[PDB]
Amino acid sequence: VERPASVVKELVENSLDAGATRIDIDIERGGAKLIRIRDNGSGIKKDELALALAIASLDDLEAIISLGFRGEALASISSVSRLTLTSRTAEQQEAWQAYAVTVKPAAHPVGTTLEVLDLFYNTPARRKFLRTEKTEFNHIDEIIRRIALARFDVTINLSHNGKIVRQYRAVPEGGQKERRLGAILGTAFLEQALAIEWQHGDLTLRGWVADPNHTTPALAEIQYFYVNGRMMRDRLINHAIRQAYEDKLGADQQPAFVLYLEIDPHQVSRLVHDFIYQGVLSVLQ
Amino acid sequence: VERPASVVKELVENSLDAGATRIDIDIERGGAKLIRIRDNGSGIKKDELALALAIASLDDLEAIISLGFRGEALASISSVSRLTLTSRTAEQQEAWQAYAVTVKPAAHPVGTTLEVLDLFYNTPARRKFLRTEKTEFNHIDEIIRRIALARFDVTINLSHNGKIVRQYRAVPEGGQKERRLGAILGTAFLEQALAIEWQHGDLTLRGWVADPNHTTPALAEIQYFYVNGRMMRDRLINHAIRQAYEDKLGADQQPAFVLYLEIDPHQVSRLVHDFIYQGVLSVLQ
Amino acid sequence: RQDNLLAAIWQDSKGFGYATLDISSGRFRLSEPADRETMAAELQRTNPAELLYAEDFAEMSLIEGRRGLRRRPLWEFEIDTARQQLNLQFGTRDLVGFGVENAPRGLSAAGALLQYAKCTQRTTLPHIRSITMEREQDSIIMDAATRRNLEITQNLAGGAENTLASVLDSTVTPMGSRMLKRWLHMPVRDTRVLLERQQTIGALQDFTAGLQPVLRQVGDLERILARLALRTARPRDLARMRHAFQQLPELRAQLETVDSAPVQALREKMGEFAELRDLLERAIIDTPPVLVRDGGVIASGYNEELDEWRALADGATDYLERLEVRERERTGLDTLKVGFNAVHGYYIQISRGQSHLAPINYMRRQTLKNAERYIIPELKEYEDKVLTSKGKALALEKQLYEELFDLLLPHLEALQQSASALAELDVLVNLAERAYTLNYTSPTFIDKPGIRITEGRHPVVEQVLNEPFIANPLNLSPQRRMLIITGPNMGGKSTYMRQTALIALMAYIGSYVPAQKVEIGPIDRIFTRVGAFMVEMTETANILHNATEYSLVLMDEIGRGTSTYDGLSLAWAVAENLANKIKALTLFATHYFELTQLPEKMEGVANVHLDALEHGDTIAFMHSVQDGAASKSYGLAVAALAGVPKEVIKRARQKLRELESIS
Amino acid sequence: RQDNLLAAIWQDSKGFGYATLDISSGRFRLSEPADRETMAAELQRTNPAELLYAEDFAEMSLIEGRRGLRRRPLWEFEIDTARQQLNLQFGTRDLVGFGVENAPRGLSAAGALLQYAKCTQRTTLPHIRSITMEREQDSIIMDAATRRNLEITQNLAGGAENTLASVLDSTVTPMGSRMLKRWLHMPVRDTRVLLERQQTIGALQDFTAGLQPVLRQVGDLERILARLALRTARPRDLARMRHAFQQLPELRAQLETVDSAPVQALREKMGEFAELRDLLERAIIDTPPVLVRDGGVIASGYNEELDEWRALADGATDYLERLEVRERERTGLDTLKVGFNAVHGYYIQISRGQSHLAPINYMRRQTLKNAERYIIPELKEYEDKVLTSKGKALALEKQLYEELFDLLLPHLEALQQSASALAELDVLVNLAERAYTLNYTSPTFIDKPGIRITEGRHPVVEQVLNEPFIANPLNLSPQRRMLIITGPNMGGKSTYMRQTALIALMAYIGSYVPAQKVEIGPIDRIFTRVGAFMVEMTETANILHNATEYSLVLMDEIGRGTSTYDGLSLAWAVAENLANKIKALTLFATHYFELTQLPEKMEGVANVHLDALEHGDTIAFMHSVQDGAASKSYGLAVAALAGVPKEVIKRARQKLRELESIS
Ligand SMILES: Nc1ncnc2c1ncn2[C@@H]1O[C@H](COP(=O)(O)OP(=O)(O)NP(=O)(O)O)[C@@H](O)[C@H]1O
Ligand SMILES: Nc1ncnc2c1ncn2[C@@H]1O[C@H](COP(=O)(O)OP(=O)(O)NP(=O)(O)O)[C@@H](O)[C@H]1O
């Protein structure tokens, strides 16, 4: 957990893993000063709070640690911060809260909220690994943009220094996907976005691609492809895509695309290349 | 009581007759809108209030009207106004107050205060006759200036439409009388004021006279002479004064003077003139 | 079936003061008709049988024909006489409690009316114990208290910081911000005007992104129009203004797609003025200076003569240089400079050391510290032509500028309304943006006085709050018109009260509201009395004297007496009057627990409270509204939160224990 | 015999933040030394055994030599980290109650100090429960509350109306009004400075009349000096300024007679600057215009060349006329006019009908609708010389003006202080006038904290009040240091409280006071908390945390809980703390009658009250202070006065009767 963005990766995954449909995020000063992720999914009980931070004390708890995959990630984070937790489960209950050394009740909706203050308190170096506040937030905005595209069904609201930055609304059952796409990637891509939908049996290719004739260097930074919702970047897939732009028009310039490959679980398969190459080439013609 | 100045004459005499040492006066709009005289002398009891406004009603009172020569002046004034009285006697008591139709208690220092709202309240004409505002107040300022000179031992504070106008301090036991003289008559007279003190037996002449060589037409308006505190104006006394200016310097211009004659009461006497003529002539030479 | 009334009337420079009375009923009323038309309409409406008028009444045409005419003297209409006399009858010293303190034109009319009645009756009239004004504006209401208390545009200390306006006013131009401020001080009742704005907010919600960038480019058009009427507008005023016109083609294009009749009407009122746009593009250089005195405003080609004069002046740059080089190389003196001075004019400067090596032709102009300056005939001739041409070029530039006003003022009428349209658009676009961004919903109106909120929140606090703001439901009607709010301090009483007032105003300006769903009826007047005793009692009376079934009333912990008993005694009798007689919609927050018996006995009353839970070394405010009353007094808990040492706290708890175990 | 203390330090742009601690005692302190000298003096004073400093600490010379030096990283001095961490220990969410909220420079130092102590101890330190700042000026301080509450220069709503300043500030010039405002926000403790002002007020009381008329003629000299430093002063600034110098001879004459060393020192600091006076009288015309651009500023004779250029220009008026007459009579054409135009220059105009009768020599210049304008060589030559001479005359006028700054700026030092002297005089003369006019007396000082008033009055209210203001005696000392004030509302509690605070400030600016006689001891801090609950408790704590024996405290009806018991329970425990531990001088106004048991049990405490008398359906307030307690609660009397209907009043009386006959 070197950057703030890697700590955000972890806690944002934990919230979505609890079935969260609204993940509202408030940051200050590149994530150094304050970070707040709140999820309205399933919460944690009064028993599972205190021990998820703090080791022969496990003697009389009796395997509650098991229900806390996320509870593991906390321990690595909370030992090196002034972590301030608060949460409430769905069932008849009042919200609870831990500190610093003293746990006590609080008020919170059905879900979980976390607060992190100013890290490194004994390291001369790991602090001196600060970059910039503005640039750290640009990597947060990057990783949020990555995970935003991977999950269209979750409302993500992002703010920084009070100032609200982004507002991704959630997709309902089979909803209008255009409004989310333009909000994540701005005006430039949405106007030249050409849809692609390809399928031979188990292989399925869903997504969007910019028109090669009207693509600029600014548009070319948007290059993401997903394998069952997890973002991959392999050089054989890049080949299928760039060769397809090359053969339609002579201008072999950096393409702009957002693609989802959906297959059966294996580590990845030659038809994979041919399926992708023919998918994009058909849409351009 | 045609003018406001004549109503002031009456109530101001009544306050001084009660042994008042501070008479504070607040006016608004030439005396039409508001007039307030407060005296801190002897007050009137709760018994002597009600019947002093409202005459076979004297039937069950038992001769309290005797203590109320002032009580008579009220009746003439209050029948033709919205008179608002309040007062308290010297011994342990609460102040009392009458209106309009309803008499009740109040809070006031040892003394008497009176409030008058545009005296005439049933006459359409007699109010409408009442002349200007600025000019009425100039006759008030005049009559105040007359009575101010007659009593140096009484503090008189005068205000109008919020604006505080004049502030005559009372003379303590054998005090500096210069501060009062300048405040009443301005800087002009005080600088040229020559003192006069003359006496043959019963006759006593006290006061001040301006130096004839440096007297202007503005100074010449100050022409007052008193007979045992009461201001008189006879042609024989004017003769003694002006003949004295004539014989000293050839410039026979209007004199500026403030003089007090003190004698035994008889209604009218040639030594009166010679005593006065020689008194002033001696001071100039 | 119609009234046998008495009336009194007068006029000053500004308008008319009017008063009416029914001596058989004790109903005593007042008004201030602003114009001659409303005055003529009010006379017809009331139908007085006798009329008192001032002898200085100018417009005799309003009254000549009316029955029961009585000419009155001027002295009777005195303002302060009226004040004293009315105070004498009601037994007050001031009239703040009657809600007519700020209406002296009406008060003078009542003062004269009063004197007449007394003299005609010559009987006491205790059946007349009050007065109320007949208010022209049926649309909109707010007393002094509410305007400041809610902090719409002004926080209570005096500034503009962290108000309602501060959060919602993310507009892009000053005139839009100003129009917003006027509409917030003016919520309208006409359901149809509100439906313009609701449809519009719904139709524009998608197009927020594309339009606001373009709106910013306008600048402060509204205030520039003031300076055009005065003949004082500046070149940089025109720079932005010109730039604003160039966006109107683009704006006309984007607005055409918005399906809304209010929008299409505004898009036409907007315009582009292609003719006046072209004029400024040709007549002025692309980036002008601040003032007209400096010149360099007018672009060349537009005027032939301006170019000519500039040619004489622009024949400077090339001419001066040729002389400098020729003279420097001729003499062999390297410190030879051709420079300019405002007092002495152009010159040839030579340094002190080289001064004695100058040519004979050089006439000395100016002697200095480090140098001697000279003049020659060639330079002196050219000096005169340049200064005179510059003078004439600059004088012409000032003349042409003034003549531009003459030709533009003919369109002044259409341009003022173009600016009013643009200000309205910035307001409404900002609103469509705030409704989407801050998660609001579309409300509906109803027949009867009543409010039903689903998941209502406080619009400013919920965003500025760095914790979960707990949304709360509200259910009110004519059958549920009064709520007894018990609970702890910092429980969220005032917040849940004030969020209701803010929510209501948003609905009556046509905006979407922070809730899942909202229904709301007609509301005639909004009243407020929040803790800062003279202060308290007079304002409560005012609310009592003027309220009706439609009235919204927000009481924040009133009923403090000069002791414990008397204050509560009042609060009980007060709520009775509001619930039983007036039947107004009321929220009554308080700490006196005994009031919670009312819901059993008074119909249309129920107990609610802000719930709190005590345990361990602390307390947890749920911030949720519940049916029922508070558990206890939480004063000892609140004092520790403010910052009090334990010495005092511990003494208080021990002492409280003694007092509670007396009985 | 030396204390073994810990300290922490750092610096930003503005100054230095400092903190000190004794871990054996639990005493925790803060400070903000403003400059290098005070900083070096504070280090010496405290004598720390160990010192934490920031790695960006620039002026290392202050700390290099001190013992126990520890270099700290920057991140430890974070302001909001300090806020959160301090809040965690004390168990608060904010630090308003500790009175260090607006001292972030100090707070950052404590935040770093805090983290070190925890690491060294590795034990809880509950013996440290608080913090207080060491405030530099031992001459006095006022909190936020008192400044606004008393309405010194600002009424509570926000304006300047009917304040203390409004009654006392009848000064004649703006800079005196401004200096007055600074001195009211700054009452001084040094006995000697107050005695300057007392002798002065006594010595000048007669001469009020002769001096204020002369002071008015000065104008705003102070702000003109700012614009002289910036090189932006205007001609009418100099007009008043010059007029101000002409009064200094007269002022020097009148002040010589005043027997007072402070006065004679000021009379010297004043000066007259006879040399600079003569300069402006000769250099500028008697009545100048507003700006420099117009010209007509510099007077003739002062400059030979300026006169020369004006002769060419002033040769206009007589020259133009001669040509007009000659040409009109020569041709026999009566419509022949000589006029001027800014664009085309001078011309000879002839009407349309006569145009064909013009001479041969006339060259046509400008053609118009109803006339033709011509030009001749004689007029065209003269045209160029006039415009160029005007330009040079005006350009010379602008140069001479700029050169006047160069010659005046060398006296700038003495002139700034001359202006400071004159501002002080307007303040003091105004004060000598107010003391005489409003009937004030000379007070005296004492050793120990105590106040003894004879016939004390409220200085603003007594004059604005349209009735007799009842003066009241006050007797306070270390043996009588707390008064329990019971009584009715509008009895005069807050007034008699606030008159005491206003009276005290007048004494500590050196002024005479509205009373027959006054004695007063030293006062270190003045504290206030008046009703507008979170609001209330935090502020009371601050007063508790920071008070001493010398402190003035004015509580106005605090101790409102979330019910009846809890609020009183606090008020009791509060007064105990003040009376027993702090021993401060206190006035405790309230409505809870049970407090009146304290004087029996607590030494230095006694009962007082505002007395009132009840009868029928009304009440009479005597407004006089009495020993003892109130008769009853008078809330029922007060409510009627506000304007409440009898329905409510009757219910309250019936109900009150039940409650009073329980017990
Ligand atoms: N010494 C006095 N002389 C004359 N009138 C006075 C005097 N003291 C007070 N009053 C009047 O009494 C009223 C009450 O003053 P105040 O002390 O504010 O009452 P309170 O008990 O503090 N209640 P509140 O005004 O509600 O805060 C004021 O309106 C004054 O006009
Ligand atoms: N619905 C809510 N959700 C979240 N926080 C709330 C809510 N309502 C109130 N609060 C917070 O709780 C505090 C208490 O609110 P408030 O209504 O001011 O109490 P109160 O009864 O007015 N006490 P006082 O100010 O002494 O009269 C406020 O400062 C809010 O920040």
Residue numbers in the entry:
A (entry chain D), B (entry chain C): 20 to 73, 80 to 125, 132 to 299, 315 to 331
C (entry chain B), D (entry chain A): 128 to 659, 670 to 800
Q: What do the paper's sentences say?
A:
MMR is initiated when a MutS homolog binds to a mismatch. Upon ATP binding MutS releases the mismatch and travels as a ‘sliding clamp’ along the DNA helix, and this specific state of MutS is recognized by MutL or its homologs. Once recruited by the MutS sliding clamp, the MutL homologs activate downstream repair. Here, we trap the transient complex between MutS and MutL to resolve a crystal structure of the MutS sliding clamp bound to MutL.
